[PDB]
Amino acid sequence: ATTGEAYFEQLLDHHNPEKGTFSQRYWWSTEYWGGPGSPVVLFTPGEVSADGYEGYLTNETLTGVYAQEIQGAVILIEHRYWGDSSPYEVLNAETLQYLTLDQAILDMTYFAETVKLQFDNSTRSNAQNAPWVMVGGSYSGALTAWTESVAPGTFWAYHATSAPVEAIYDYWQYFYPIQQGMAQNCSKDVSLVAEYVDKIGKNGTAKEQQALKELFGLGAVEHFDDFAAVLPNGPYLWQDNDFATGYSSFFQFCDAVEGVEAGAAVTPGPEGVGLEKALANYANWFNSTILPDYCASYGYWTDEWSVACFDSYNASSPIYTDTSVGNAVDRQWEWFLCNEPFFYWQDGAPEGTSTIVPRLVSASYWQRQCPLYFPETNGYTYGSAKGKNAATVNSWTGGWDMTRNTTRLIWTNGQYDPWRDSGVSSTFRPGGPLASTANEPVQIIPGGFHCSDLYMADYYANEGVKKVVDNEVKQIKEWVEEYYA
């Protein structure tokens, strides 16, 4: 009773049943369940082992809150090819061929119709006889949206928060919301430094380049674009923020760039400190607070001051060659990027557009790594090597244009979510950010980050988030009640 774990026999290839099944881990809770015929909330963590995600079964998360508000069960399902839910122990271009969006979608619908639940083994709790609500954020949010688009008729309702539904090759706009959200002074100074790094990369002497690398403690990094590629570590911490993280790693970064200590009486205004100070501060912040134990955290290395993990040009690096399901880099997600292909390459902005990341960090810098991760094996290669591209995925899914004709799907996006401009509220989406309708609601959380509505800590910290949560819960509750009308 109440909680449990089990294995579901998921179809390897939904288009060829006869190729067989594999074991896929899921967890359940009936804590708020009303009994046979009551609703069910389904959620996958997405691109990660499900270990330590048990919280999504409780009302400390939005999934548990939905369940509580509609008297439903809650099921956490581990995504295929992660954790204990991989059909193969070795992951290369051949074995990864069944890690595709299409498969992942049909997993969800097939599971909802097919699973034999321990808590109700009469089919009264399956999707045929009870309203299932699929919820997700980030990639899992996209999978949720993509399912409503590609495979409607199983789930009663869908909620996708921070969903990158549009595949984008040169996703320089990853950084644009960070640039909008950051302090004026930090934004300006980080920009200065990023542009200076471009300048030295292109038009500097060998000594100037060696010296610049020394400032960051990266004298030993061979390729100048590998060095440039570490600078985004600053802006990347924006993605770790929510409304309950306070003076987080990100805000420490900005303070370091501006050159002040936490709680300083005297701070610079919006003008900032300028290049000379900013560069010094940025380099020292990285050298002293980020570099130590950075490579060691991958497990493949152990020296505190190692720079081995920064080498994107070494084809033998364990980052590329570790084919195991438990690999440290999440090559499973890299597969989706190179194969589907999503790409989502996080780049410096085009000439003529202000950037907070060096232009030397380019789409090409990332695309070069795909064949290192996935060398041709038995004639099998990554999709984008056979000229599959962004348009390939978008034609089929609809991308951010799947919004034309939707049924009981609600969206949430964050004002300053790095993933915003790959989703329906992108400032760069043709027709503009998607206009909310009663049929297809979209809310943008003011000052929001990535999936800021999933954590109930954010509900209590922030009025904006509470507002948004109340609305979307009420919307799911109204839609769910309609099922029984």
Ligand SMILES: *[C@@H]1O[C@H](CO)[C@@H](O[C@@H]2O[C@H](CO)[C@@H](OC3O[C@H](CO[C@H]4O[C@H](CO[C@H]5O[C@H](CO)[C@@H](O)[C@H](O)[C@@H]5O)[C@@H](O)[C@H](O[C@H]5O[C@H](CO)[C@@H](O)[C@H](O)[C@@H]5O[C@H]5O[C@H](CO)[C@@H](O)[C@H](O)[C@@H]5O)[C@@H]4O)[C@@H](O)[C@H](O[C@H]4O[C@H](CO)[C@@H](O)[C@H](O)[C@@H]4O[C@H]4O[C@H](CO)[C@@H](O)[C@H](O)[C@@H]4O[C@H]4O[C@H](CO)[C@@H](O)[C@H](O)[C@@H]4O)[C@@H]3O)[C@H](O)[C@H]2NC(C)=O)[C@H](O)[C@H]1NC(C)=O
């Ligand atoms: C120019 O450059 C400046 C330098 O970089 C730059 O400055 C800083 O700006 C950033 C951006 O806002 C500041 O960020 C944050 O800081 C907030 C915390 O502040 C206090 O604490 C820090 C750190 O110190 C302490 O803690 C450490 C250990 O953790 C100790 O070692 C230490 O002893 C301290 O206790 C400190 O730096 C701050 O200091 C200043 O402000 C105090 C007043 O509070 C002054 O006394 C002091 O002199 C400092 O100020 C001076 O600078 C300001 C300008 O910033 C001048 O006006 C002033 O005259 C002085 O010169 C504070 O002591 C932190 O809460 C912020 O985070 C919140 O928001 C983010 C973003 O949304 C959320 O992700 C996060 O979860 C958190 O959210 C919550 O609060 C929101 C309300 O803002 C709310 O919407 C949200 O829901 C959530 O709230 C709820 O939770 C709260 C608890 O977390 C709760 O209170 C609330 O009720 C809700 O429950 C953010 O991290 C950064 O601190 C500044 N750094 C400085 C000044 O040193 C400046 O902005 C740039 N300017 C321009 C124009 O570009």
Ligand SMILES: *[C@@H]1O[C@H](CO)[C@@H](O[C@H]2O[C@H](CO)[C@@H](O[C@H]3O[C@H](CO)[C@@H](O)[C@H](O)[C@@H]3O)[C@H](O)[C@H]2NC(C)=O)[C@H](O)[C@H]1NC(C)=O
């Ligand atoms: C920026 O990054 C550098 C590495 O790229 C850091 O360095 C060095 O770090 C330590 C600390 O100085 C040196 O080590 C020694 O530490 C022990 C401490 O007891 C000594 O007993 C012994 O002499 C060690 O050799 C490293 O050797 C040195 N590494 C390299 C490759 O130079 C540097 O500290 C860092 N700068 C900042 C400000 O953090």
Ligand SMILES: *[C@@H]1O[C@H](CO)[C@@H](O[C@H]2O[C@H](CO)[C@@H](O)[C@H](O)[C@H]2NC(C)=O)[C@H](O)[C@H]1NC(C)=O
């Ligand atoms: C979140 O869920 C918990 C656990 O179900 C809720 O907790 C408790 O509150 C119930 C309703 O008031 C009580 O009847 C239970 O005795 C109590 N359970 C436990 C284990 O402490 C909690 O209220 C929910 N949070 C909100 C804001 O509704």
Ligand SMILES: *[C@@H]1O[C@H](CO)[C@@H](O[C@H]2O[C@H](CO)[C@@H](O)[C@H](O)[C@H]2NC(C)=O)[C@H](O)[C@H]1NC(C)=O
């Ligand atoms: C490229 O990566 C490989 C694999 O990690 C590096 O390999 C090796 O070098 C280490 C550093 O001395 C040795 O300690 C390892 O035993 C060794 N491992 C293997 C599998 O060869 C290699 O040095 C890297 N090459 C460059 C030029 O950096």
Ligand SMILES: *[C@@H]1O[C@H](CO)[C@@H](O)[C@H](O)[C@H]1NC(C)=O
């Ligand atoms: C369903 O569960 C009940 C629980 O007691 C069990 O007795 C019954 O045999 C189960 N039926 C089937 C068909 O598995």
Ligand SMILES: *[C@@H]1O[C@H](CO)[C@@H](O)[C@H](O)[C@H]1NC(C)=O
């Ligand atoms: C480097 O030099 C070229 C040619 O003078 C110039 O047009 C360009 O702006 C410089 N590039 C960078 C990145 O600063």
Ligand SMILES: *[C@@H]1O[C@H](CO)[C@@H](O)[C@H](O)[C@H]1NC(C)=O
């Ligand atoms: C929208 O889709 C529904 C369900 O597939 C369909 O029945 C309806 O006719 C469509 N409407 C439009 C305007 O395309």
